[PDB]
Amino acid sequence: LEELMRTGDYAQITNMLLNNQPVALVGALPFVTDSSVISLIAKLDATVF
Amino acid sequence: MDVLYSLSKTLKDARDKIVEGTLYSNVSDLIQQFNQMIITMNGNEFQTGGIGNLPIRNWNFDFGLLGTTLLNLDANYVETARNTIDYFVDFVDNVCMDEMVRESQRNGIAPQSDSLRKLSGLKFKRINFDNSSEYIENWNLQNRRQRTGFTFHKPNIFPYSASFTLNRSQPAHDNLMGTMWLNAGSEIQVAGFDYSCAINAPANTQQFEHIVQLRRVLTTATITLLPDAERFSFPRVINSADGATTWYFNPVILRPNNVEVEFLLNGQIINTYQARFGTIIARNFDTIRLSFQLMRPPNMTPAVAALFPNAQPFEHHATVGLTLRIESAVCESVLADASETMLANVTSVRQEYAIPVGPVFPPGMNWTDLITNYSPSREDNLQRVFTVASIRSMLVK
Amino acid sequence: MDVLYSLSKTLKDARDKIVEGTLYSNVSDLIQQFNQMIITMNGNEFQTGGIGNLPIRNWNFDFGLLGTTLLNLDANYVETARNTIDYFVDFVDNVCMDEMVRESQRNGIAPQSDSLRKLSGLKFKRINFDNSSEYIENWNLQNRRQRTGFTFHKPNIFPYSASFTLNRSQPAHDNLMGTMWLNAGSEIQVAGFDYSCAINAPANTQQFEHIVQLRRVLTTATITLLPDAERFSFPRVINSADGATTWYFNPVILRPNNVEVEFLLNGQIINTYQARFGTIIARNFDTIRLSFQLMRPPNMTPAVAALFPNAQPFEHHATVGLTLRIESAVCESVLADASETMLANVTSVRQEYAIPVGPVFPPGMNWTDLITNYSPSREDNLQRVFTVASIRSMLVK
Amino acid sequence: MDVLYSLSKTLKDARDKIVEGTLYSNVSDLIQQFNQMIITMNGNEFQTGGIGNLPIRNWNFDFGLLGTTLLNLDANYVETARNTIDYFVDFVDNVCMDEMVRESQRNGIAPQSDSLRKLSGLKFKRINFDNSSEYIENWNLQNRRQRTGFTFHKPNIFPYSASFTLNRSQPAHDNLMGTMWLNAGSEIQVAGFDYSCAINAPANTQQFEHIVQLRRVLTTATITLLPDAERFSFPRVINSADGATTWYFNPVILRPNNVEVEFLLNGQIINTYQARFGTIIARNFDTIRLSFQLMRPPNMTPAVAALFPNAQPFEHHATVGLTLRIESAVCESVLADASETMLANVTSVRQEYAIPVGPVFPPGMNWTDLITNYSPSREDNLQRVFTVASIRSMLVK
Amino acid sequence: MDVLYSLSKTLKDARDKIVEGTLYSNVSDLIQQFNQMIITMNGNEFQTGGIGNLPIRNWNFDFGLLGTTLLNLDANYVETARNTIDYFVDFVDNVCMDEMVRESQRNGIAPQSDSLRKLSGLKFKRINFDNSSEYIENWNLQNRRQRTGFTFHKPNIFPYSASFTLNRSQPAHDNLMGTMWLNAGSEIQVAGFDYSCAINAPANTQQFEHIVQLRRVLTTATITLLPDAERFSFPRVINSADGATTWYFNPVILRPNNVEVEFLLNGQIINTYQARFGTIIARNFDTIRLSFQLMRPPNMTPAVAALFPNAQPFEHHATVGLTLRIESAVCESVLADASETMLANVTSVRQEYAIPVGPVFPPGMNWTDLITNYSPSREDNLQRVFTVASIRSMLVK
Ligand SMILES: [Zn+2]
Numbered sequence A: 001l002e003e004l005m006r007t008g009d010y011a012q013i014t015n016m017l018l019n020n021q022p023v024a025l026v027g028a029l030p031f032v033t034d035s036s037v038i039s040l041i042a043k044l045d046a047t048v049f
Numbered sequence B, C, D, E: 001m002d003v004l005y006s007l008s009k010t011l012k013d014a015r016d017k018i019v020e021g022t023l024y025s026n027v028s029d030l031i032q033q034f035n036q037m038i039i040t041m042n043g044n045e046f047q048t049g050g051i052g053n054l055p056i057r058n059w060n061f062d063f064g065l066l067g068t069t070l071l072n073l074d075a076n077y078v079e080t081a082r083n084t085i086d087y088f089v090d091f092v093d094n095v096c097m098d099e100m101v102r103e104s105q106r107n108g109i110a111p112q113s114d115s116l117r118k119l120s121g122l123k124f125k126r127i128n129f130d131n132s133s134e135y136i137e138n139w140n141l142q143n144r145r146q147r148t149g150f151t152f153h154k155p156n157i158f159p160y161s162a163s164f165t166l167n168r169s170q171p172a173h174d175n176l177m178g179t180m181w182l183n184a185g186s187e188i189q190v191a192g193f194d195y196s197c198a199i200n201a202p203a204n205t206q207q208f209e210h211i212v213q214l215r216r217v218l219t220t221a222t223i224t225l226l227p228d229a230e231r232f233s234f235p236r237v238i239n240s241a242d243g244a245t246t247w248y249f250n251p252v253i254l255r256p257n258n259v260e261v262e263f264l265l266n267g268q269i270i271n272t273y274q275a276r277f278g279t280i281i282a283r284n285f286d287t288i289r290l291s292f293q294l295m296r297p298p299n300m301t302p303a304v305a306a307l308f309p310n311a312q313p314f315e316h317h318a319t320v321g322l323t324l325r326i327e328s329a330v331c332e333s334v335l336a337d338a339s340e341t342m343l344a345n346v347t348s349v350r351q352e353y354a355i356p357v358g359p360v361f362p363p364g365m366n367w368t369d370l371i372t373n374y375s376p377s378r379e380d381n382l383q384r385v386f387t388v389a390s391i392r393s394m395l396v397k
């Protein structure tokens, strides 16, 4: 991540995300807890991105 | 297919223009092209092998793009790159080889492998570039249809053929008349012999002729034509036509008389040369016809007269000959020649991996057998296979 | 002239780098160059032909241009382009061919055709580009009056010459001494024969010598020198010097004694090799001198002794020989060789279009005749004509 | 070293892509690279020569840059440039030559000259660029240690060797049996002779064999194999093994029986061909073994029967032979061949400047001597020296 | 590879510099390095063995670091450490052994095992350090390209060879002349015998010569040369050359006359010594040539005269000899010698685990067979395998 922001994106990520491909992000980050059983059901974790 | 090409000039114009030293800007137009690739790739998976002693390695992708740290590259930049290229190298090899073995009668002019059938896919076309490699240059022009063309030194157009034809013979083989020859590669040697030295022949002249039909037309051929066939200028003991016995050939050489070489195309004389030895040009032909004569010497010193009596036994056999060599030529079809390694590359990869004989090519990719029955299917497969060998040689020799 | 060149690498580096797919920025530096041309052209009229069986197709100009958008290239982009290139292709062909026939005693080194005389014009100069094609690279360096240079595998420096010289002879031709040879292309074979096997010669040794004068200096030559002349190792019936009769040659071969090869330049020995067979280097020479001897064997087994009596008749003729082949060399003047198609291209275009014999070149562009009298005019015309053939082969083979 | 390379493709891709006309943009990526150089240089001082008849020359630097301004290129721009290039040309020449003579046992690989030892310096590395020149492409890969490779037409792998081996002989040399051959360059000719025509041999067959051990492995070889050894098909008077007398060879040729060619690698058969004449592929080998037989004809016409009596004297000597030519092949080590001028360039520069014999190379860079004892030191020095010759030929031929 | 090295000097310079007491600061620079490792490891699983009697032990990682706090190490600190080292020890052993058997004809110089192929990985190189162990010092320099070099004692360059050559013999073997020798390891003993004591020899002197060709060049050799070959100074009954009978050798020793030892390199004399016994230096050679003579004593006391009659039977056989021993030398290639345990380590591990014969090494790692056909593949594999043995011996003997 650091290596991205501190250097702007080329969308490499944009493409991988778009043709919806398996990918990871390294480093520190926020983080949000949630207890909504339902939530999971509305695959929220697939949003934000 | 064209896809494949790029993948290489990509790497060569890469593993070459990328060194510890050059300024970025000398590769800006290059870096770009490169990355573009990486993207399209990562994700999709590939299978190679699955035949004879050919390993089946599975290739998967996952790579980060390329920095830019201005003002000439720092060593550290290279290594983190070479490490990413060496996966593509060791890859492509395993890719070429896989489609460099499969053959197909019906449509054996197109992709066969589970590796390539996926490359011609559309989502990949986004790569093609710098098509200056003589072979691809010609692959394309062929898909649209037009005057293609290749360059060969000492081309390999003549299937090996070494034989004779006795026009006059008898059981004892003591008074023969005929021709013997060797057609092989780019060379022809032919001798006409007359044991009687034309003693009873009209005008004391015996006519000879040798015709060679090429399996493909050659254009713009530079040819050396010389009198005499050294190969048939020495004493020989030869098997008879029926294999039942052996005859004796004891040549004495005379200059070929009224030499005429014709380079014909579809029965028409395109070039004709009368007694011209040295370098001659044959611009377009599918057949060569060599006509020459043995003329009994009208005046003979005693030593000569003694070789040619009026009656048998004929112990010195009058012989006249010609030697013709195609130094260079252009052919619209791929051929083996004395400089290109294509045939050897294809043949070598198949031999090394114990690839089973297929339905198209003769066992061992035998050149004589191949050129003797150079069918459209063999040519399309040969061209595909030669083009791949040439793509491979840009990186792996 | 230099103009002409561009017109091609323009198209090749074009018909090659423009394919359904590729990223634009690999051609930005290219597209530009291209357009520039179109402009300069549009608004000009041209004429080709008007000689022998050569059409007289006429051409006009008025074309569009090209986008500078699109990250990647869409098929539609190509076709609307290929259609515009195919007019330049079919054009240039008709252009090369037109100036590839006209010869001029005077300034045969300059432009001739109504097509080209207009190209050297100044308003066209705004087009030159990428001159790395071995031939143009050399054209320029020459116009600037400087040291040229070329590459040839098995060059064609020796005009065909096959003859003999009898140093000792008599009417019966039963006790001759002399040499016979074949100089052709890049090869020389020479044999020295002495029917008497040096029986009455001082030190029982007969000296031989063969000198060959090149019409142009060859530098950096890699040469194969081998003992024996296979071509003159077999029985022959030959015409006498005056053509009045025929003599008999019945060779038996001995090793050439005291072999010395000298490569001279303007009378000076530049390289000399004493009995060294195999690969030798001759770095700069205009003459080759081969000296060798026949030495009567001082000790002979009965079978050998029987071949060489003290008195005539001499029935086995002692022969010693040498074979020399120039594998590669550099020449400051264009020459035909065993790999390049230039001579064949020029000769072929002239033959196909029934071009009449002109004032400079021998009938049929005959190589032997050309190299035998390689005048400055023939060389300047040959170079112009070879350079054009090479420009043409970048697009049309 | 890699340094050196650039200095050239710099100039070529320069003296070529820069002329009265063209748009800036097609060289923008080029101009830059160029300047970068000038800078690094200016101030630094050099020295070349000082060995044998080699001129010692000192050079300094202090030059202007380039108008990265203008759109087009006006004549005036060129001239003010060519004048600056012609100092680098005449320079590099004097540079190559200087390091193209020094040899060294220990580190025969690395640089030698006071000119180059300063180039490998770090502050100069700021210059590498476009390494598609077949030779550099291979120099690098050799440092990183990996499978390299080169392309050769009629290669030069066989040191000259012309001899014989008498397997059965006697003082009179009237009933011999053995083989004679010529190994040279890329060709082998070998003949097996039996004066008795296998009259007392088991199955009336005499076996022959010829083994040739290459000093380096050849891969992907395209080979021509033909029956008969023309070189040993004519009458000869030869010196005896001990040099005390001479014997007579009077051959009559029969077809070689049970021909088997084996291309071995470390004692293992990699390729084997049984009686296959024409074009064959040997994919990886360090040894060639040719086995062939003379089989007494079971059926003979009178003329033939007369040549082969049951008792001596044996006057016609039965001979069978083979001819093998390596048209092309790949070698991991540099070698001389029939097309490349490297050996000739190195040998020529040394000869022209009267360079004294050194500790590594044989006198005169003699190829036979070199390949016969092709030590690691000779190969490393040869490669360094060949790579430099190739860098030089990009500018000076 | 280099990776592997560290893993050890890590442990040695560890299991050595860590003892109950030592003041911390002797290891600060050490502790660090250590930890760094642990990190890189933990989390990656490993696999070894899988052939013959080689167990397939599996491994895992998850270890606490090492409190760099304390000023003086307390016993408790050690034990909690030794327990963590003993997993790496018992590990590395199982690692070395695994790659100390696998062999490859092609790239038999690089890593093979599923254990090591993963070590050369990039994420691991974060470890390398302190490469002073003679062997690694040399591994690198070789991977980098330069004059390597190892140190020996009574090296093992001569494959065992014990034989004779009879230059004059007859069925009864009662008047022989020839040489017999023993070449083995670093020693050569050769004797020249003449049953006739040069009675009929020119100048009453019989010349002898013994040539030994090394498979690798030895440099900086300290050699002992002594007159006489004790091994061939006693009575023997020997088998005849054809094995059909036995001959009697009854030597009487005389001083070798005109002794000349030449140490040649590629046919050139590098060092020559005339009759110099004791210690001599041969600085660079690939061949040793020993020439010596037997000179019949011109003056003989009765007792001596009685041994050498003018006529047979010859009952006392005059013999002269030499003994040469290479005490120490340097070789650019690994070799077995009289001090290093490498060959024995490799051979022993393979024997203990019943490792099957592979494609590279001779059965049992037989030294004579190995050095006799010391191919590049055997040398690369031997060096890899010797370097690993040396890494192992730093911890396990
Ligand atoms: Zn050739």
Ligand SMILES: [Zn+2]
Residues within 6 Å of the ligand: E154, E338
């Ligand atoms: Zn000791």
